[PDB]
Structures are given as structure tokens and as C-alpha cells.
Design a protein around this ligand. Sequence first.
Ligand SMILES: NC(=O)c1ccc[n+]([C@@H]2O[C@H](COP(=O)([O-])OP(=O)(O)OC[C@H]3O[C@@H](n4cnc5c(N)ncnc54)[C@H](OP(=O)(O)O)[C@@H]3O)[C@@H](O)[C@H]2O)c1
Ligand SMILES: O=C(O)c1ccccc1Nc1cccc(C(F)(F)F)c1
Length: 318
Amino acid sequence: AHMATFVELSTKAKMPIVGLGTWKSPLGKVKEAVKVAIDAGYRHIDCAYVYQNEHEVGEAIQEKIQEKAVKREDLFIVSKLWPTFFERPLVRKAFEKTLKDLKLSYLDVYLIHWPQGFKSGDDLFPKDDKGNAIGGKATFLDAWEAMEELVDEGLVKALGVSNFSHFQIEKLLNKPGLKYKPVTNQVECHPYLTQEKLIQYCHSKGITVTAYSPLGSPDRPWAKPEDPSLLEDPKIKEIAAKHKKTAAQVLIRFHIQRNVIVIPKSVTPARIVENIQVFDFKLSDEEMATILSFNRNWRACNVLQSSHLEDYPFDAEY
Ligand SMILES: NC(=O)c1ccc[n+]([C@@H]2O[C@H](COP(=O)([O-])OP(=O)(O)OC[C@H]3O[C@@H](n4cnc5c(N)ncnc54)[C@H](OP(=O)(O)O)[C@@H]3O)[C@@H](O)[C@H]2O)c1
Ligand SMILES: O=C(O)c1ccccc1Nc1cccc(C(F)(F)F)c1
């Protein structure tokens, strides 16, 4: 039985520092993973409309609630609003599909998944005849206002953002009539992309950071053989052996010691358990400085390439 440390949000809700990520996987693979996770002691599950797999997650949580394995109040469920749904009637409609598939009556956190609004319509990745993304009418600011209504109505406990730079967080924070603040910024983070200035910024504003792709997302479709490889990184493995731990566990523990929430994904039961076995060791302050020095500003997750649209987050330094 395991329990992740709590990270307290500006709303005083407690966010488990390790969560289970839910990257697309067939078919009931993700459902069992959620079941296995809950068994092992995970309470934080990270979800997304775009994965189109949220119903599996829903079946899993439902069954474990009836089985009496877990209660709702102890689960910490996060999902996100995809950019093609920023227009106000769409926000509510996308959210409702999320909350339905998940068979919940509320989310602990609802995130803006990406800062740039995309063309509304059937496509989730609207593109021109030349491949480039098509912008939409509503902004992330427009979306946020609709999302704040969800909080007003007790459908969501707290809001946050994902893939935001500090310039975009600044715009959100300085928005007139702002009701609710982002409790987290979920972004890619690992030793090749250490996000030092952004984490500094968020924390200075009382906004937590959630590290995604902490293992380098090896299963990403667009990987290349020469794309650097965190899990196979000899200097990571060496630090691991020193603690009698796996490379994956070191990569996870790295965020924990920076006070950064982290959501490693696995549909393999042995790995799910292993990925939460990370509160029995501690990297030395010298091991942490060594890992921090691996920063090469490499993004595994930069597929969108809507660098032509307004509010592209990765143009910013941080
Ligand atoms: N924009 C966003 O907000 C955003 C973007 C990307 C990801 N995310 C979230 O973050 C989560 C995690 O990121 P990710 O899925 O991109 O990549 P990740 O967690 O860095 O890596 C997942 C991959 O590593 C494998 N793996 C898991 N544990 C392992 C272990 N102990 N040893 C060796 N291999 C292991 C998994 O394989 P098996 O599953 O086959 O075990 C899977 O292929 C996602 O599921 C999603 O929830 C959010
Ligand atoms: O997975 C995210 O959170 C994500 C975020 C921004 C851009 C792309 C993203 N990934 C994504 C989007 C659609 C389908 C799949 C895949 F099925 F490959 F997992 C992965």
C-alpha cells in the first residue's frame, strides 16, 4: 500500500504529488491500469478528452467505488478542455462529455489543455490544405470564463492550465473580472527540459507545476531513433543503481524533490506499482544538481506546430 505526498493548492485542496497518466491505449488496457493504480494506492488520475479513452477510465473508477476499494473524496481526478471547444456553448458541451464518460459528478481539476484556440467542428486537429492548424474564434480567456461557471456550479473544484508560458499565465492572472486562479500549470518536464524559470515563475505565483512526459514519452508516435532517450540514459541508470531503483523511478523522484507534481503513464501493472514506489529513497543534493545539468531544452511533446497561430507557447523563453 502506497501513498503519494500531498501538494497543497492555493485552494487548500490536496493534490497527490504522483498521478497516473492516461495516454491513448487499446482497449481496456487503460481501464485495468486505473484499477491496478487504485489498488496500489494511486488517487491522482490524469485524463484528457483528446485521448478519446475517458470512458474506460470511468468504468474502472466506477467498479472500484462499488467494490469499496476507494471513495470519491479520496480520488483526485483531472481532465482538460481541448482547444477546438473554447467557444462558450462548446466548453460546456465538451466538459459534459468528459464528465459523462468519467461517470463523475465533479472533477477535482479542469485544465485548459493548450493555449491556442482551434477551429470548431468535427476535427480535433483542424488543418488547412497544407497541414497547418486552423485557428478558432474564442480565446483561452474566453474558455476560462466559461470554465469558471463550472466552478460556480460545483461541477469542478479548481481550474488550471496546460502548456502555458509565463506570458500566458500573466494574461490570465491580469484578466479583468477574473474569478478563479489556475491551481496548476501542467507542462512537459524531465531532465532534458528542466523548466527552471517557468517553475520558478509559477511557484512565485502560488501555482503548482505538473510534469508530464517525465519518462520522455517513449511511445510517442513521432519519436526518432536519434531523439535523446531518458530511460536508456546511462547517467540516469547509474544514479538509479546507486539507490537500487529503476531509471524510471529516478526520473519520477526528480520532480518530487523539486516539489513538482508528476504523472507517469503506464498500462503495465508491474510498472504502475514501481512508478509509485518512489517515497523510500532520496537523491542527494549533488545527484539533483547533476540531473538538473542534463537540461538540453528538448521537447518530446511538440507535435502541434501551430507556430503560425497566435499564442504559441514554445516561442517564449519560459
Ligand atoms: N499536453 C498535456 O497536457 C500532456 C501531454 C503529454 C502527456 N500528458 C499526460 O502525462 C502522462 C504521461 O506522459 P506520457 O504518457 O506522454 O509519457 P511518459 O509517462 O513519460 O512515458 C510513458 C511510456 O513509458 C512507459 N513506462 C511507464 N512506466 C515505465 C517504467 N517504470 N519503466 C519503463 N517504461 C515505462 C510506458 O509503457 P507501458 O504503458 O507500455 O508500460 C509508456 O510507453 C500522459 O499519459 C498524459 O496523462 C499530458
Ligand atoms: O497527449 C496530450 O496531452 C497532447 C497534448 C498536445 C498535443 C498532442 C497531445 N498528444 C496526443 C494527441 C492525440 C493523440 C495522441 C495519441 F493517441 F498518440 F496518444 C496523443
